[PDB]
Every structure is written in structure tokens, then in C-alpha cells.
């Protein structure tokens, strides 16, 4: 670990500076170093970890989609042969993306999830496990595609089970988990009806619980509810 000589608190401080500078690769490396100190992460620290890697992998995924679309067009009839370069470069980006997902999944397995006992931390990390297996599924084409998809499903399902038992229906982690598991159903698992049902039930149960919230909590929950509503409008 190249961050092994830096203090935990300094890694966290630098992760926050990296966020301000929009240096998300640095942010992710600082937060990886902080995780590898072996202590559990606070709520704020968990969100720094997720923001960092979401931005890194988000850029890789967008690049992969651009290259995959060019590669698909090259394989249409009447397309001029251009050589192996598009496939090679798409593969290079794909391998880098898979490496980042494997890094995140490795941090969760060694040893964030096994030490996470509170609902807020455990659900958060299981959502992350589902998300990063989902990103692996987006690029999978081979013999393990079904197992990758089932790994994402299983992680999301455990997170859902805990969130429904331990969290109110307006909790932003619960809402964001449902948002993403719904998208998993729609576009990974070929289950658009399940995706729509999950988004609708999640939205409706949150609606009914808004009356219990402070103004600030209401703002937090309604923001994610609007994402669920947007997806429902797109899909129906």
C-alpha cells in the first residue's frame, strides 16, 4: 500500500481536498488507504469512499459505452474494415473498469462488510457490493455473466431485507438502494415489471412516512423520491 505511511486522519483530510479539486482518482486512492488502516468507517467516511469510486467508475463506464457503440457500428453491414484497434481499446478500458470494481469489492470483502453491524453501515456496504457487481455485469459477455448477475442480486437482496426490517421507508440509504435495485431489475435482469413495482411501492411507502420528518430530512427523502418518480415516468 503506497498510502501505508500516511496517517488515517491525513488520508481523510486529503480525500476531502481531492473532492474539492475534482481529483477523484486521488480521492479514491486516499480512501482506499484509509480503509486499509483496518478501522471501521464513520458515516461521513463511507460517503467519501462511495463518492470517490462512483466518480472514477462513472467515467470509465461512460468511456466504455462510447467505445462499445463505435465497435457495434463497425460490425454493421457495409461498414469499412478498420482493424483491431476499436476492440483493443474498448478491451483496455474494460479491463481498467473491471480492475476498479474488483478493488472496491475487495475492500468490501476485506473487511468492511464483516465488521459492519449497524443497519446504516451494513446496508450501505451491501448496496455498494450490488452496485459494483452490477457494473461488472454491464460489461460481462462470457460464462460467468449469470454468476456476476446473481452476485449483484444477492447483495441487493440482503441489503433490502435489512433495510425493510431496520430502517424507516424514508431513509435515504433505503431509498437509494431501492432506486438502484429497481434499475438492476429493469436493465440487467430483464425484469421491467419488477423494476416498476419496486420503484412504485418504494415511492408510495416513503410518501406515507414524510409526515414524521423534520424539514431537512423531508428535503433529503423527497430528492431521492423524485429520482424514483423520474424513472417511473421514463418507464411507463
Amino acid at each position: 500500500g503506497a498510502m501505508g505511511s500516511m496517517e488515517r486522519a491525513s488520508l481523510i483530510q486529503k480525500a476531502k481536498l481531492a473532492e474539492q479539486a475534482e481529483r477523484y482518482e486521488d480521492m479514491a486512492a486516499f480512501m482506499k488507504g484509509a480503509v486499509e488502516k483496518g478501522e471501521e468507517l464513520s458515516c461521513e467516511e463511507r460517503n467519501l469512499l462511495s463518492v470517490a469510486y462512483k466518480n472514477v467508475v462513472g467515467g470509465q463506464r461512460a468511456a466504455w459505452r462510447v467505445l462499445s457503440s463505435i465497435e457495434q457500428k463497425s460490425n454493421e453491414e457495409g461498414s469499412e474494415e478498420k482493424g483491431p484497434e476499436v476492440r483493443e481499446y474498448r478491451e483496455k478500458v474494460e479491463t481498467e473498469l473491471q480492475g476498479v470494481c474488483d478493488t472496491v469489492l475487495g475492500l468490501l470483502d476485506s473487511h468492511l462488510i464483516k465488521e459492519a453491524g449497524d443497519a446504516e453501515s451494513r446496508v450501505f456496504y451491501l448496496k455498494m457490493k450490488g452496485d459494483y457487481y452490477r457494473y461488472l455485469a454491464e460489461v460481462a459477455t462470457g460464462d460467468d455473466k449469470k454468476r456476476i448477475i446473481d452476485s449483484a442480486r444477492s447483495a441487493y437482496q440482503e441489503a433490502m431485507d435489512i433495510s425493510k426490517k431496520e430502517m424507516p421507508p424514508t431513509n435515504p440509504i433505503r431509498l437509494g438502494l431501492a432506486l438502484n435495485f429497481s434499475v438492476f431489475h429493469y436493465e440487467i435482469a430483464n425484469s421491467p415489471e419488477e423494476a416498476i413495482s419496486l420503484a412504485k411501492t418504494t415511492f408510495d411507502e416513503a410518501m406515507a412516512d414524510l409526515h414524521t420528518l423534520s424539514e431537512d430530512s423531508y428535503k433529503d427523502s423527497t430528492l431521492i423520491m423524485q429520482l424514483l418518480r423520474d424513472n417511473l415516468t421514463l418507464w411507463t
Binding site: 452496485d131 437509494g176 432506486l179 438502484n180 429493469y186 436493465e187 431521492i224 424513472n231 421514463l234
Partner: peptide
């Protein structure tokens, strides 16, 4: 637009 994840 495109679907949201978070």
C-alpha cells in the same frame, strides 16, 4: 432522459 442511479 436517462434513468437515475445513485
Amino acid at each position: 432522459n436517462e434513468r437515475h442511479t445513485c
